Design a binder for this molecule. Structure first.
Ligand SMILES: [Cl-]
Ligand SMILES: [Cl-]
Ligand SMILES: [Cl-]
Ligand SMILES: [Cl-]
Ligand SMILES: [Cl-]
Ligand code: NA
Ligand code: NA
Lengths: 90, 52, 52, 53, 52
């Protein structure tokens, strides 16, 4: 039921909110810690990029397209009333 | 222009969703419970440290 | 809890920073518009159409 | 007529702001109650954990 | 019993927090109105119309 962007947005907000782990009390998990924290750090990077660069960029580009073709919602196939063939071609 | 308007929009939205998250966490933090080590004289100091 | 609050705050900084930058783009973009009008690159007739 | 509305709006802004303080107090009361309750459950749980041993 | 009460209270906090936020918007919005009126009362002929 949520838009595509809402779904990615949710995931991003959700990942950003996580806290890095500290398994220093468990020597057996030292490797899981560096794996999790590196993974997390990277994911937050990706999330930020989506939230403040990509999502806006997408919304922008589509707005521009959306406006232009809203105005030019059709193509004159015949010679519109009162124009040189020269003007129509331009 | 068009792109600037959208940056304002997105900026606002990211700030408001973020705000709800920290708002919730703050209400959640304020609800936390102190410790009571009164049965352990050896931890009296840890208690006043933790609760402060 | 503290660690988590710390993260919430860090996220809040990011969000606030993005808001500042969004406002900075608006101000700078209005500045460009003032310059373009003054230099005669644009007029209030076509700027009006932009805004509408 | 504009100045009277501005004065009036200013009065209402102050009232709005005051209402908000009342609400802050309400929030803290609720937060205290919520917390005391969490504490009760925790302390009961620990007594039961003990009795089960 | 207390677990249940705890939940009711937690829900009440959320509700009260929502009330806070609602009043904050009203206050801020009244502020904007006060500014717009004040700057319209002390301004030029078309600048006055902008603010009003
Ligand atoms: Cl654009
Ligand atoms: Cl002891
Ligand atoms: Cl204490
Ligand atoms: Cl009152
Ligand atoms: Cl109890
Ligand atoms: Na990752
Ligand atoms: Na600037």
């Amino acid at each position: 039921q949520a838009s595509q962007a809402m779904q990615i947005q949710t995931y991003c907000n959700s990942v950003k909110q996580q806290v890095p782990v500290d398994f220093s009390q468990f020597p057996n998990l030292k490797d899981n810690q560096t794996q999790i924290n590196q993974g997390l750090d990277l994911a937050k990077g990706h999330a930020d990029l989506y939230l403040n660069t990509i999502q806006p960029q997408i919304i922008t580009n589509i707005s521009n397209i959306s406006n232009y073709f809203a105005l030019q919602n059709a193509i004159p196939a015949v010679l519109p009333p009162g124009s040189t063939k020269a003007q129509w071609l331009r | 222009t068009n792109a600037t308007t959208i940056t304002m929009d997105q900026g606002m939205a990211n700030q408001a969703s973020q705000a709800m998250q920290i708002q919730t966490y703050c209400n959640s933090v304020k609800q936390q419970v102190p410790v009571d080590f009164s049965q352990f004289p050896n931890l009296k100091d840890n208690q006043t440290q933790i609760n402060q | 809890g503290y660690k988590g609050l710390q993260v919430q705050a860090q996220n809040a900084v990011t969000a606030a920073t993005q808001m500042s930058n969004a406002w900075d783009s608006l101000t700078s973009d209005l500045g460009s518009l003032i310059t373009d009008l003054d230099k005669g690159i644009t007029s209030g007739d076509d700027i009006r159409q932009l805004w509408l | 007529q504009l100045s009277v509305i501005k004065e009036q709006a200013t009065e209402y802004q102050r009232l709005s702001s005051d209402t908000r303080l009342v609400i802050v107090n309400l929030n803290n009361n609720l937060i205290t109650d919520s917390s005391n309750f969490q504490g009760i459950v925790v302390n009961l749980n620990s007594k039961v954990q003990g009795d089960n041993g």
